[PDB]
Amino acid sequence: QLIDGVWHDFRNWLTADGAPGPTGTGGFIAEKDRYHLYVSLACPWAHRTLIMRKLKGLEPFISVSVVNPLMLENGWTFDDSFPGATGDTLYQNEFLYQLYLHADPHYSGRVTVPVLWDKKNHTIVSNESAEIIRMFNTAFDALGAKAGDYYPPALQTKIDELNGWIYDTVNNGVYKAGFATSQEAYDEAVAKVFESLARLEQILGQHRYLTGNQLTEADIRLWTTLVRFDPVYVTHFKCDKHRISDYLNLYGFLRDIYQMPGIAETVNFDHIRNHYFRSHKTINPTGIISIGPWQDLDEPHGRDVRF
Amino acid sequence: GQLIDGVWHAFRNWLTADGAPGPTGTGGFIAEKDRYHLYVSLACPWAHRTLIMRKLKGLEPFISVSVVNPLMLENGWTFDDSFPGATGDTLYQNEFLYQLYLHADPHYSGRVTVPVLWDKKNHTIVSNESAEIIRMFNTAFDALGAKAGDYYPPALQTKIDELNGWIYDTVNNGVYKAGFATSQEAYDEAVAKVFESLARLEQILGQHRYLTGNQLTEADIRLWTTLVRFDPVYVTHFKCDKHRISDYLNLYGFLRDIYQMPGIAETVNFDHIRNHYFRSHKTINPTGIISIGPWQDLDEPHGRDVRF
Numbered sequence: 001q002l003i004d005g006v007w008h009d010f011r012n013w014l015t016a017d018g019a020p021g022p023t024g025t026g027g028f029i030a031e032k033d034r035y036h037l038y039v040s041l042a043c044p045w046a047h048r049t050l051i052m053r054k055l056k057g058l059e060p061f062i063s064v065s066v067v068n069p070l071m072l073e074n075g076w077t078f079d080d081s082f083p084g085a086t087g088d089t090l091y092q093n094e095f096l097y098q099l100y101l102h103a104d105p106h107y108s109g110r111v112t113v114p115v116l117w118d119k120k121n122h123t124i125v126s127n128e129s130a131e132i133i134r135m136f137n138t139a140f141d142a143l144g145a146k147a148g149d150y151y152p153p154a155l156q157t158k159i160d161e162l163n164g165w166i167y168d169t170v171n172n173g174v175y176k177a178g179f180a181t182s183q184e185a186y187d188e189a190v191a192k193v194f195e196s197l198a199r200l201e202q203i204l205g206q207h208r209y210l211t212g213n214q215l216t217e218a219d220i221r222l223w224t225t226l227v228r229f230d231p232v233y234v235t236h237f238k239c240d241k242h243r244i245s246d247y248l249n250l251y252g253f254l255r256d257i258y259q260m261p262g263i264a265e266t267v268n269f270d271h272i273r274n275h276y277f278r279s280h281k282t283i284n285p286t287g288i289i290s291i292g293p294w295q296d297l298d299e300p301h302g303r304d305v306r307f
Numbered sequence: 308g309q310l311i312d313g314v315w316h317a318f319r320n321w322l323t324a325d326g327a328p329g330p331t332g333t334g335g336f337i338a339e340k341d342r343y344h345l346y347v348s349l350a351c352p353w354a355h356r357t358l359i360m361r362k363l364k365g366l367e368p369f370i371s372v373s374v375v376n377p378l379m380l381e382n383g384w385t386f387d388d389s390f391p392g393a394t395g396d397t398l399y400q401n402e403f404l405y406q407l408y409l410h411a412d413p414h415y416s417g418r419v420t421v422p423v424l425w426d427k428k429n430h431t432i433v434s435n436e437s438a439e440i441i442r443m444f445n446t447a448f449d450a451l452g453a454k455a456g457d458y459y460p461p462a463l464q465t466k467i468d469e470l471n472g473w474i475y476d477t478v479n480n481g482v483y484k485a486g487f488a489t490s491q492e493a494y495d496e497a498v499a500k501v502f503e504s505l506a507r508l509e510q511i512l513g514q515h516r517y518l519t520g521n522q523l524t525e526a527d528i529r530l531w532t533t534l535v536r537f538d539p540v541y542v543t544h545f546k547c548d549k550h551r552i553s554d555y556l557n558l559y560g561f562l563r564d565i566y567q568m569p570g571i572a573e574t575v576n577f578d579h580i581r582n583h584y585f586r587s588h589k590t591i592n593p594t595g596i597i598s599i600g601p602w603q604d605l606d607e608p609h610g611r612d613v614r615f
């Protein structure tokens with residue numbers, strides 16, 4: 001935590017014309033060589049932002065820094081000793097909270113990934129992943145982004161509806177199971193996880209993706225939890241009733257997005273498993289990383305022909 | 308913890324058909340009714356072997372049982388009886404299992420373990436080595452009406468010993484070595500050996516019904532007590548999570564085959580087992596939360612009685 005500007009223990013919109021979005025300030029016009037993502041490869045929220053960058057072909061426009069997977073007493077850090085942890089490749093800060101202080105040195109609240117950072121004004125555009133992926137969706141189209149709209153008007157209300165119960169019962173739902181303070185809270189969170197997986201399995205037996213045969217952001221947001229579920233949540237958070245590999249549709253959906261060009265390289269299981277097992281000392285005091293459930297995400301899925 | 312000079316912070320006699328000594332300890336523990344008692348936890352795979360052998364060999368009329376409480380906390384095993392199927396000390400109403408050890412030796416130094424084979428006549432411990440208790444049970448009551456059955460018959464002894472040796476090292480104890488590992492390197496080497504032994508067992512149990520052939524032996528029993536705990540506990544709690552027993556055709560068939568033999572299911576209590584491991588092992592599982600647990604159904608028919 002950061003309390004009135006020191007360490008104990010941002011809702012602007014990037015926009016095609018530079019007009020402010022529906023919250024925050026304006027002056028964040030889309031353009032090359034200006035904007036930067038600070039992420040962990042471990043964090044499913046930050047991961048959404050990396051997936052949207054690959055699908056929208058934003059590599060030439062958005063540079064990236066990867067914080068160390070080990071999130072200790074200092075929160076996220078720029079220690080660069082772990083492969084694919086890059087350091088702060090902008091200012092070579094040492095701690096993520098530094099970028100936050102630089103933007104607002106009386107800042108009160110959490111120091112989270114991802115952060116969308118403006119290299120021109122040295123400040124933070126956003127640290128809301130749900131909104132960063134909406135920017136990436138359209139803000140660079142005129143500049144040459146790849147075609148695709150992952151939040152198109154006709155699906156927005158279905159999308160928002162999905163995002164709401166997936167966030168609560170699945171994205172966040174695993175954390176509620178894993179960090180439950182009591183048996184009773186654990187039972188209730190984990191039951192909800194699995195009751196939602198069952199509902200998802202049925203949806204994904206009707207068509208390719210959650211809303212039908214188009215890929216949307218609701219898919220992406222589900223997917224970054226799914227891809228972490230067998231390697232971490234099953235054992236580490238004790239969501240162990242079934243593995244994603246036991247569901248015909250969820251596992252096919254897992255593999256279908258995994259195998260989209262560019263997506264696999266966004267997935268670093270070393271960061272993922274080191275982060276969760278070694279960082280959560282209140283649930284895993286030993287810091288031992290489990291060998292982890294067997295799976296093979298490269299096996300053909302057939303969901304492209306089936307649907 | 309453990310007992311040091313009689314203070315809370317090794318028994319190797321043999322019960323025999325004629326009261327002669329076994330290869331260790333002293334003599335005088337002749338088989339007979341109303342003399343011998345087991346103290347067990349329903350959670351403990353080593354204590355479970357002695358419950359299974361008691362059923363297979365029909366020893367209920369000879370051996371009475373107390374079940375300690377599944378929660379092993381600051382006092383070691385206790386006779387708190389607030390848990391269903393925990394019985395208290397149905398002989399002396401002690402408080403703690405360690406009191407039984409102190410009675411046998413009032414300045415005892417060592418661990419206080421289940422199972423204990425206890426002699427009601429002389430108020431002492433016959434044995435607290437499960438591997439030897441099952442061999443006593445196997446033959447010592449045979450002239451008194453034990454059901455026919457030899458689970459360590461002369462012709463199979465070398466094969467059974469060779470199996471027990473690696474099974475014990477890499478699977479019965481191997482899951483403990485993984486779950487209690489102190490470093491990543493030691494966890495890695497232990498969990499690797501668990502799954503390597505499971506792959507080899509899966510190949511064995513694809514050739515015939517049981518480990519040595521078509522006959523059940525004590526090597527099967529000893530394996531089985533670890534297998535029956537593997538999906539409910541070891542997979543998550545000890546991080547032995549690469550594969551579940553339910554993913555292996557032959558191990559899962561063999562797990563169900565023994566489960567479904569008359570008398571065996573009543574020896575299995577998943578409440579004790581899950582409560583014991585998740586709730587007692589604070590160094591591994593500080594919160595004491597019991598995971599919902601990997602899905603399985605041990606009642607499904609197995610086919611192994613005809614397949615081979």
Ligand SMILES: N[C@@H](CCC(=O)N[C@@H](CS)C(=O)NCC(=O)O)C(=O)O
Pocket residue numbers: 001043044045046075076110111112113114127128129130
């Ligand atoms: N709403 C934020 C959530 C991001 C978030 O919660 N990130 C976690 C990663 S799991 C984090 O950086 N936590 C650091 C902390 O809380 O100290 C988003 O959507 O981006």
Ligand SMILES: N[C@@H](CCC(=O)N[C@@H](CS)C(=O)NCC(=O)O)C(=O)O
Pocket residue numbers: 308350351352353354383418419420421422435436437438
């Ligand atoms: N070799 C003994 C060991 C039995 C054993 O280690 N039992 C564990 C039960 S899982 C125990 O009572 N542990 C208590 C302790 O070590 O403090 C046997 O085969 O019976």
